[PDB]
């Protein structure tokens, strides 16, 4: 079927540059125009640009003219966005998307995140949350992990490397003082913990960090 | 430029009922070719936007006829019938008739269900965090409805406002509930100058607070 995969997103400093790519598959690439659309962290959608099948005819938001450039390599099924002179407000998730008869944005990729700021890359501290040692238990038990002091987004949390998908709540990061904090909770039956291992897995691509914290009952 | 405005900001409706969303353009949006490229997108939580409706009222293949759009000139309307939980998320209108092409600001659709009290759990700082000089107290308030809830912290029975950071999920479409997280962050030395840490949740489902706490002099 039709697949689009963006890449290249990451942390960049005000004034800097960054090239993004969108790999396309399942259709004859040169036959369709493509668009870049971006979404702010507070979820506002904004068309950035559209480029024709063979690349000659481009339109773009005036506030990105000269700083951002758009081109494609049809034989490699790849669309680009060369960014320069980045500002805070360019910060957004960047989506490419293909046209179709009568529709502008018919197929979308997953998006790649561009963070524009000068706070520096900081890896997370990952803390296991077991219930207090004087606490009561509890037929379905709630366990947590706290992922603190990281930058930039995103981090991926999982539990038993995805094998516990069931009772999970992973909360959106909150930014403070140039660091993000986040938590994830998981609720499992009392028969399964502590007798078996429960563990959260926290990935932070930007720092190539991957941490597994086993949740151990406390001491009294 | 064309400005595209949506109302309402969000909309609750029950299962089986019909939602109706407005999108108004600051000026007309007939393309030079005489077509009107008004489109409707749905972004479900954690996902990319998907197309529902193009050229005002055409249903993109795969999209059921519970969804249909209408309107003219400057005034458009998207109607969802027989609403299921899986339909929640933010619905976006978009004009692609005059560059620069613009989206509305979004309308969040919430799915009604019966009230539910949050499940509340409190977690003292991990030994490992204390070792590095931090002391975060964490309180999960899970699987509740409706959205509105209020968390107050106490230290030794006095209210506490500084260092509290809350976070909420979007609506889960599996059970139609919300969950939230509340983190009280202190230094080790301030944590150790006090005993009693409490998070109280107040929620429509109860006249009085659900209260979780622990004393350090018991661990």
């Amino acid at each position: 079927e039709v697949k689009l995969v963006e890449s290249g997103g990451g942390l960049v400093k005000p004034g800097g540059s960054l090239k993004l790519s969108c790999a396309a598959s399942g259709f004859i690439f040169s036959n369709y125009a493509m668009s870049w659309v971006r979404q702010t962290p507070e979820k506002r959608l904004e068309w950035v640009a559209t480029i024709s099948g063979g690349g000659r005819n481009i339109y773009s938001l005036d506030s990105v003219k000269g700083r951002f450039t758009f081109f494609r390599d049809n034989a490699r099924n790849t669309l680009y966005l060369q960014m320069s002179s980045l500002r805070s407000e360019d910060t957004a998730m960047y989506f490419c998307s293909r046209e179709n008869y009568g529709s502008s944005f018919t197929y979308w990729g997953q998006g790649t995140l561009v963070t524009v700021s000068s706070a520096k890359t900081t890896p997370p501290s990952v803390y296991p949350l077991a219930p207090g040692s004087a606490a009561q238990t509890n037929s379905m038990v709630t366990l947590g992990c706290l992922v603190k002091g990281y930058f930039p987004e995103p981090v991926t949390v999982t539990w038993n490397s995805g094998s516990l998908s069931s009772g999970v709540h992973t909360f959106p990061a909150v930014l403070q003082s140039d660091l993000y904090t986040l938590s994830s909770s998981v609720t499992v039956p009392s028969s399964t913990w502590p007798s078996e291992t429960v563990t959260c897995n926290v990935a932070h691509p930007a720092s190539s960090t991957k941490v597994d914290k086993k949740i151990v009952p406390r001491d009294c | 430029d064309v400005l595209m405005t949506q109302t309402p900001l969000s909309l609750p409706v029950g299962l089986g009922d019909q939602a109706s969303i407005s999108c108004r353009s600051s000026q007309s949006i007939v393309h030079s070719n005489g077509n009107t490229y008004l489109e409707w997108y749905l972004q479900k939580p954690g996902q990319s936007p998907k197309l529902l409706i193009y050229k005002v009222s055409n249903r993109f293949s795969g999209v059921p006829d519970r969804f249909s759009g209408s309107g003219s000139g400057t005034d458009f309307t998207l109607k969802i019938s027989r609403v299921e939980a899986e339909d929640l998320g933010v619905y976006y209108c978009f004009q692609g008739s005059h560059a620069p092409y613009t989206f509305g600001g979004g309308t969040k659709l919430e799915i009604k269900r019966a009230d539910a009290a949050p499940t509340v759990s409190i977690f003292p700082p991990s030994s490992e965090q204390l070792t590095s000089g931090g002391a975060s107290v964490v309180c999960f308030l899970n699987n509740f409805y409706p959205k509105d809830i209020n968390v107050k912290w106490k230290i030794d029975g006095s209210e506490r406002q500084n260092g509290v950071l809350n976070s909420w999920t979007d609506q889960d479409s599996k059970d139609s509930t919300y969950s939230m997280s509340s983190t009280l962050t202190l230094t080790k030395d301030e944590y150790e100058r006090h005993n009693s840490y409490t998070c109280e949740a107040t929620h429509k489902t109860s006249t009085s607070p659900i209260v979780k706490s622990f004393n350090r002099n018991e661990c």
């Binding site: 559209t50 024709s52 046209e99 | 070719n33």
Partner: peptide, 11 residues
């Protein structure tokens, strides 16, 4: 100038 390749064609 119009950058769409298929969008503006009616079926």
């Amino acid at each position: 100038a119009e950058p769409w390749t298929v969008r503006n064609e009616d079926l």
